[PDB]
C-alpha cells in the first residue's frame, strides 16, 4: 500500500510525538505502577528467580546447569543500548521486548531468556514490570552466584510500543564501516548520537574493529563507545571483567545454520527466533554470536579467575567452530569445564576485547590493580552495575522498594533533602509581586525559567529546574542561556530570596530553584495582564538547591541545548533541518504536537528568543501573552521568501505593497507549511481562541516547569 | 534513519488503531463539536460565503469574477474519494486538507480554494469544522449561481491526522494500467476496495481510459467507479452534467510549467503548491488539469445549456494548449465567454467523459430525458448532490442544523422513529430471564448479537444493530451469520418479543433490535456466572426495527463480512494475510489494540466462532467468561506447527509428550507472535488479570453494541 512516507520521504514526521497514547495502553488511565510495585513481595519474587537459575527447560537447556550468565547478559544488553548524547535507550522502558531491539543480532537468544521469565512475570502480573524484572533477574543471577550487589531500585513502568530512536542509517545488519551509510568519518569518529560501532550491536565488535583482531585497536572502540554510554575507564574495565567472570559465548557450528530473527520468524515460532539447524539447535550445540569462549574455571560462581587467566597466560589467535576470531591459552592445561559433558574440559579462551583490558596501557593499569586487589574489583563492579542498570531511571525520588542504596552518587545529579517548611500560596503571591517590582522584565523572567526547566529530557529523566544548576558550571555559561543576561537576573533573584528568607519565622525559606520557576510564573502572569487577562499560573514549591560539588560538570555537557526551536536557537549549522530538531526537542520534553505548537507561539511573543532575535516575533505587543504568532503567521496578506544572505531565514512582506513586516526561521514557518502543524496553528489563530490559547499556554508552561518533579508523583 | 518498517516491511502494522489519539487533538477531551455547531449562526456563515463568491483575490483571481465553479469542484472532490467497499474516504472528516489528498494531482489548485476559506474558518473558529465548511461552501456556490439545493446537515467533526487508507500500490502518480502494481486485471476489473482508475484521481481520467479518447470506453470506467461510490446511472448523469453546468477547466500552457505539489513544496510556499511558471501562473493563465474546456454560455449561472450543447453539436477531437485530448463543437460560433477578457469568446468544448453521457446508450437515454425535461434534471441533481456530500455521514440522528431535509431517503438506511415508552431496568431483567429460560445457549446469544452489532463501520457510520436488519435480506443469509442457526435464534426471540409486547400496558413495547442486543447481554451474564463471577452488562434500549423496504439489499452487500477474525471467519482465500484483515476490521469497529485483544480472547471462549470451530478455543470451559485464551495461548509447554494440509492452520502440542492440545489459525496465533500484541496478551494472561479481563471485556462488548447509537449522543 503506498504511504505518505513513500510519496514525501523528507516531510517532517510528527508521529514520534503521539506514541504512547492511552489507546495503546492496556492498563486503565488511573493505573499507577509505583503503587503496584510498592506492594509487591520483592523477596518472594527473588526467591522464585533464585530457583529459576538452576531449573533448566529442555527447549533451551541451561549451560552448566545454571542460567545466571544468560541472564546477566540479558540485563547488561537491556541497559547497554543507552547513549548519553540524547539519553535514549537503556533498560528503563523494557524496550528489549519490542522491535527492533528484540531482533538485533547482539540480542540473539535473549528471546529465550525473556521467555524463561514468563512464568514469574505471569505470577506477579502488574506488580512487577518487564523493565524492572529484566534488571532484577540480572541481580538475582549475580547474588545466586556469590556476588554482593550494590542494591536495586524498582519503578521502571512498562511501555507498550517501540520508541522511535535513531540507531543509524545502515540498511544492512552489522555492516562494516565505510559503507554508503557509514556511521564513521574522519579518524574513526563515530556520529552523534550513536554509541555502537555497527548497526545491531550493543557497543563493539567482539572480534575487534570491523573484524580485525587487534586488542589494541579494539580498546579504542571500547573506550569511545563506553564513554558514549557514560562509563569511564575504571567502570569499563570493572564491567567487562565482571560480566565475563560468568557463563560462556555460543558458537558450536557455522552461523549459516541460524535462521530468522524474531521479527522475521514465522508465526508458529510464537515470538522466538534464531532457530538453528545445527545438531540439536540448543544447549551443547548453541549458536548465538558464533564465538566459543568460556572465561573461567567456575562459570557459575563469582571469582577472580578472569584476571588470573588474562594475566597468567600468553594468548594465541585461533577460530571458533563458526570461523570467528578468538584467543586461546595453548600452554594451559584443560582446566575450564564443559557446559554439558562432565568428562570434557577445555583450555582458557578470551575474546579480542577481553585482551584489550591487558594490552591497552591505560586499561592494563586498572586491570592489574583489580587482579591484585579483587575486593576493589568487586566493589567497582557492583557500583558500575548499579550505575549501568539505573543510569536512565531519573532522580532518586523515582526509586522504589527495600533495596535502594542509601549512598548518593555523583552521577545521579543529586538534589539535597528539604528539611524546612515550604512557602504557601500567600508567600508565593508575595514573591511574585516582589519579582515584578524589581524591574525584571517579562522577557527576562520567561527566558530564565525556560532555560532552567527545559533541560529536562524524558529519555533518561535527567535535567529540569530542580537543583538550580542554571547558576552553576557549566549551565551558567551555555551560549543558549545568555550568560551575561542570566547572571544579572540571578543576582536580582538572589537578593529577593535573601530578603524574603531573612524576614521569615520558624524555619520557612525558599530555594533559588523554586524562586527561578516562581519568577517565570510571575512573568507569564504579567504577560497575560499586559494582554488584559487576569490569570494565576500554578506553582508547586519544593525544589532544592544543589552545590557545585554535587554537580559533575562533564556529565552535564550532554544536556546543553545546541538546538532549541523554542528559543529560535541553533548553535551551529547542522545537516538535519531545524524543524526536525524542534520535533526532537519536543519529544525529549514529552510534548505532544498541540503542546509544542501552543508553547512555541507563546514563547515567541513573550521575548524568549536567544539574543532578542526578532525571528518569529509576529506581534506588535511583545511581552503580552496573545495568539498573535498564529494570527499573523496565517495571514494570507503576507508573502514569504527566503533571504539572499541566508536561505534558512525568510522575509514576510505585504503581498500588495512589498513592505517588510516580519522575518522568520524554518522553525517559525514550519507552522504555516506542514499540513498537520498548520491545522494546529489554525485552531489557535481563530477569532474564538484567545482564552483557549492562554489556558493551553499556562498548562504547558506549568508542565515544563514540573517535568522533573517526581517528588510530587 | 532506518526504521522497523525498513527491516520488517511485512510485520503487521498496529499504528492504524491508535490514530486520532487525544495526543494529536488540539481540542480538550470534553470538546463536543455538535454542541458548538448547534450554536453557530449558520445564516451568518452563509452570508459570508455568498460575499466571498465574488471577492476575487489577486493571488488566485476568480474566473468570470465568481469562485462558484472552483468551490463546487472543491466540494465534489472532498466527497469524491468515498468507496462503498469499506466506507473510507468521503467528505465527512475533512481529509482533503491532509496528506496525501491535499497533494493528489486531481486536487490541484484546490489548495487555493481552501485558503480562500481561511478568513471564514478563522472568524467562526471551532463552531464550524473544515469538513462541514468545504461542503457548505459548495452549497452556497450552487445557491449563489441560481441552483436550489436539497438541504445541508452539519456535524462532520474535524480530524487532526491523515487516515490510513489503502489508495493503491502504484509508486508513480497517475500511472496507467498494467504496470507492476496494476490496479486492473482481467477484463478491466478494478481491485477492491479501490474506486478510481489511477493513483491520485477522484474517479476516472477525463481524457478517456488510460488516456485513450473513446467516450464509449470512458463510460464503462465512469459507471464502474461511480457505482463503487454508491451512485447509479441516473445519479451519475445528473452529477456530471450538473457539475459541468458551471465553471471551467484550466490548461492554458504546458504542464511542465507546474511545480511541486503542496507536500513537496518549499516551506515558503506556506502550505500551497503547484506554483506555475506559465505567464502569470494564475487566472487567465491557470493550469490545473491541463484541459481547457468551458461548458456553457453562462458559466456562473444555472442553465440548461450543458445538454443543449452536448446534443446540439457534433464533436471533433482536438488538443488543449497543454496537449491534452478534448473536444470542440464542429461548425459552432464563438458563443462561450472568456473567463477574463470581455472581448474574447470561444467555441463550445467538452471532455471525453462528458461525451460519454451521449455516446453510452444507457446514459444517452437519461441525458435525453434530462434535456427534454430539465425540471427532472434539476431535481435529480439536487438529490444526488445531497447524497454525494452526505453519504458518509451516518444515521440521520447525526445531522445537525436548520437545513436538514425532512425527507427520509433509502440510502440513509433509515430507522423508524420510536413512538412508545421504552422498557426499563425491571423489564430488561424480566426479558433476560425469559431469554435464558428459553434454552438459547451462551454461544447462540453471543454469536447473534455479535453478528447484528459488528456490521458497523466508522468510516461511513453504516451498519450496527439498530434496525434489526439481521432478520432481513441480505444479512439473514450471509454465510458469516450462519443463516440456519440464526433463523432458529430469531424465531425464539420473536416469540419472546411477541409474548412480552402482548402482555403490556399502554403503549410499551420492545423492538426485536433491542431484544437481540439484550439477549446477547444475557448470554454474557450467563457466561460470567458459569465462570463463578457476578457481572452486570449494561444495556441501553431505544433501537427500532427497520423494514425490508427501508433496507436496500444491493447497498447492504458491501457490509457483508467476508473476513471476521472475531469469529475466526474467512469466506475465501485472499492475498492479504488474515491478521492484516483482523486489524482492518478492528479499525472499522473503532477498536484500539487493547480492545481488539480482549474482545477476541473473550469471543473465542464464549463460542462465537462460525461453525463451532475449535480454532482458538483455548479453554476446557467453553461458554464461561474467563481469560483462558490468553493463559493457554502463552503457555510455553505447548509447541505450535503448521499443518501439512493447510499452512494457515496450526497444531499446538504438548512439548514433552506430543499430545495434541489445541488448533489455531493465524488470527489466533498472531497474539502469541507479534511483539506488541503478545505484550497485550501477557497483561490479560497474568495471574492477577481475571477480573480486569472480565471488566474490559464487558466494556468493549458494550462499546460494540452501541456503535450506531447516535440517538444517545
Ligand atoms: C566490550 C564489551 C563487551 C563485549 C564485546 C561483549 C561480548 C560478548 C559476546 C560476543 C558474548 C557471547 C554471546 C553468545 O555467543 O552467547 C558475551 C557474553 C556475555 N557477556 Fe559480554 N561483552 C562485553 C561486555 C559485557 C558486560 C559489560 C557484561 C556485564 C557486566 C557482559 C556480560 C556477559 C555475560 C554474562 C555473557 C555470557 C552469556 C551466557 O553465559 O550465556 N559482557 N559477551
Ligand atoms: C466523470 C466524472 C468527472 C470527471 C472526469 C471530471 C473532470 C473534471 C476536470 C478534469 C475538471 C478540470 C479541473 C481544472 O483543470 O481546473 C473539472 C472541473 C469541474 N468539475 Fe468535474 N469531472 C467529473 C465530475 C464532476 C462532478 C460529479 C461534479 C460536481 C457535481 C463536477 C464539477 C466540476 C466543476 C464545477 C468544475 C469546474 C471548476 C472550476 O470552475 O474551477 N465534476 N471536472
Ligand atoms: Cl528509548
Ligand atoms: Cl478516510
Ligand atoms: Na532512555
Ligand atoms: Na469515510
Curated annotation (Swiss-Prot), chains A, B:
Q: Where is this cross-link: Tryptophyl-tyrosyl-methioninium (Tyr-Met) (with W-91)?
A: 203-229
The enzyme's main class, written as a single word, is oxidoreductase
Q: From the UniProt record, list the reaction(s) this protein catalyses.
A: H2O2 + AH2 = A + 2 H2O; 2 H2O2 = O2 + 2 H2O
Keywords, ordered alphabetically: Heme, Hydrogen peroxide, Iron, Metal-binding, Oxidoreductase, Peroxidase
UniProt modification remark: Formation of the three residue Trp-Tyr-Met cross-link is important for the catalase, but not the peroxidase activity of the enzyme.
GO MF terms listed in the record are: catalase activity; heme binding; metal ion binding
Q: What InterPro entries does the annotation carry?
A: Catalase_peroxidase (IPR000763), Haem_peroxidase (IPR002016), Haem_peroxidase_sf (IPR010255), Peroxidases_AS (IPR019794), Peroxidases_heam-ligand_BS (IPR019793)
Q: Which Pfam families match?
A: peroxidase
Q: Does the keyword Iron apply?
A: yes
Cofactor note (record): Binds 1 heme b (iron(II)-protoporphyrin IX) group per dimer.
Family of the protein in this entry? Belongs to the peroxidase family. Peroxidase/catalase subfamily.
Subunit record text: Homodimer or homotetramer.
| Protein name stated in the entry | Catalase-peroxidase
Amino acid at each position: 500500500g503506498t504511504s505518505n512516507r513513500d510519496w514525501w520521504p523528507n516531510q517532517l514526521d510528527l508521529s514520534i510525538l503521539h506514541r504512547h497514547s492511552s489507546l495503546s495502553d492496556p492498563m486503565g488511565k488511573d493505573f499507577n505502577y509505583a503503587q503496584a510495585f510498592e506492594k509487591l513481595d520483592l523477596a518472594a519474587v527473588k526467591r522464585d528467580l533464585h530457583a529459576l537459575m538452576t531449573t533448566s527447560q529442555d527447549w533451551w537447556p541451561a549451560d552448566f546447569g545454571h542460567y545466571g550468565g544468560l541472564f546477566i547478559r540479558m540485563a547488561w544488553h537491556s541497559a547497554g543500548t543507552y547513549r548519553t548524547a540524547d539519553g535514549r535507550g537503556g533498560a528503563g522502558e523494557g524496550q528489549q521486548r519490542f522491535a527492533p531491539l528484540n531482533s538485533w543480532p547482539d540480542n540473539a537468544n535473549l528471546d529465550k531468556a525473556r521467555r524463561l521469565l514468563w512464568p514469574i512475570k505471569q505470577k506477579y502480573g502488574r506488580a512487577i514490570s518487564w523493565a524492572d524484572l529484566l534488571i532484577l533477574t540480572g541481580n538475582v543471577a549475580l547474588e545466586s552466584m556469590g556476588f554482593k550487589t550494590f542494591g536495586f531500585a524498582g519503578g521502571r513502568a512498562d511501555t507498550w510500543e517501540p520508541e522511535d530512536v535513531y540507531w543509524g542509517s545502515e540498511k544492512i545488519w552489522l555492516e562494516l564501516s565505510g559503507g554508503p551509510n557509514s556511521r564513521y568519518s574522519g579518524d574513526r569518529q563515530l556520529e552523534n548520537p550513536l554509541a555502537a560501532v555497527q548497526m545491531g550491536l550493543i557497543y563493539v565488535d567482539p572480534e575487534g574493529p570491523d573484524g580485525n583482531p587487534d586488542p589494541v585497536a579494539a580498546a579504542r572502540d571500547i573506550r569511545d563507545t563506553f564513554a558514549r554510554m557514560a562509563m569511564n575507564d575504571e567502570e569499563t574495565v570493572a564491567l567487562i571483567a565482571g560480566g565475563h567472570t560468568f557463563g560462556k559465548t555460543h558458537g558450536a557450528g557455522p552461523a549459516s545454520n541460524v535462521g530468522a530473527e524474531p521479527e522475521a520468524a514465522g508465526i508458529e515460532a510464537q515470538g522466538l527466533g534464531w532457530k538453528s539447524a545445527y545438531r540439536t539447535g540448543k544447549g551443547a550445540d548453541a549458536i548465538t554470536s558464533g564465538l566459543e569462549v568460556t572465561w573461567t574455571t567456575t562459570p557459575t560462581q563469582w571469582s577472580h579467575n578472569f584476571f588470573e587467566n588474562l594475566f597468567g597466560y600468553e594468548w594465541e589467535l585461533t577460530k571458533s567452530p563458526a570461523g570467528a576470531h578468538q584467543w586461546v591459552a595453548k600452554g594451559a592445561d584443560a582446566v575450564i569445564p564443559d557446559a554439558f559433558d562432565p568428562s570434557k574440559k577445555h583450555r582458557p579462551t578470551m575474546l579480542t576485547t577481553d585482551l584489550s583490558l591487558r594490552f591497552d596501557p591505560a586499561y592494563e593499569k586498572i586491570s592489574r590493580r583489580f587482579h591484585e586487589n579483587p575486593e576493589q574489583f568487586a566493589d567497582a563492579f557492583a557500583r558500575a552495575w548499579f550505575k549501568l542498570t539505573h543510569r536512565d531511571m531519573g532522580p532518586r525520588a523515582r526509586y522504589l522498594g527495600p533495596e535502594v542504596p542509601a549512598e548518593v552518587l555523583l552521577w545521579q545529579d543529586p538534589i539535597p533533602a528539604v528539611d524546612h517548611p515550604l512557602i504557601d500560596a500567600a508567600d508565593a503571591a508575595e514573591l511574585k509581586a516582589k519579582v515584578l517590582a524589581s524591574g525584571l522584565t517579562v522577557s527576562q523572567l520567561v527566558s530564565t525559567a525556560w532555560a532552567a526547566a527545559s533541560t529536562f529530557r524524558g529519555s533518561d529523566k535527567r535535567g529540569g529546574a530542580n537543583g538550580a544548576r542554571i547558576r552553576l558550571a557549566p549551565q551558567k555559561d551555555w551560549e543558549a542561556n545568555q550568560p551575561e543576561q542570566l547572571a544579572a537576573v540571578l543576582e536580582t533573584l538572589e537578593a529577593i530570596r535573601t530578603a524574603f528568607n531573612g524576614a521569615q519565622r520558624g524555619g520557612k525559606q525558599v530555594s533559588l530553584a523554586d524562586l527561578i520557576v516562581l519568577a517565570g510564573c510571575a512573568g507569564v502572569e504579567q504577560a497575560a495582564k499586559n494582554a488584559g487577562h487576569a490569570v494565576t499560573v500554578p506553582f508547586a514549591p519544593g525544589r532544592a538547591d544543589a552545590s557545585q560539588e554535587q554537580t559533575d560538570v562533564e556529565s552535564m555537557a550532554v544536556l546543553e541545548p545546541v538546538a532549541d526551536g523554542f528559543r529560535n536557537y541553533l548553535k551551529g549549522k547542522y545537516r538535519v533541518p531545524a524543524e526536525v530538531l524542534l520535533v526532537d526537542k519536543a519529544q525529549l520534553l514529552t510534548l505532544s504536537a498541540p503542546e509544542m505548537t501552543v508553547l512555541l507561539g507563546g514563547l515567541r511573543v513573550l521575548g524568549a528568543n536567544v539574543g532578542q532575535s526578532r525571528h518569529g516575533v509576529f506581534t506588535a505587543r511583545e511581552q503580552a501573552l496573545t495568539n498573535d504568532f498564529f494570527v499573523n503567521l496565517l495571514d494570507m496578506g503576507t508573502e514569504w521568501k527566503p533571504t539572499a544572505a541566508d536561505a534558512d531565514v525568510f522575509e514576510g512582506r505585504d503581498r500588495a505593497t512589498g513592505e517588510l513586516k516580519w522575518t522568520g526561521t524554518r522553525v517559525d514557518l514550519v507552522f504555516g507549511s506542514h499540513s498537520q502543524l498548520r491545522a494546529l496553528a489554525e485552531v489557535y489563530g481563530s477569532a474564538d481562541a484567545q482564552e483557549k490559547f492562554v489556558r493551553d499556554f499556562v498548562a504547558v508552561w506549568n508542565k515544563v516547569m514540573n517535568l522533573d518533579r517526581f517528588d510530587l508523583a
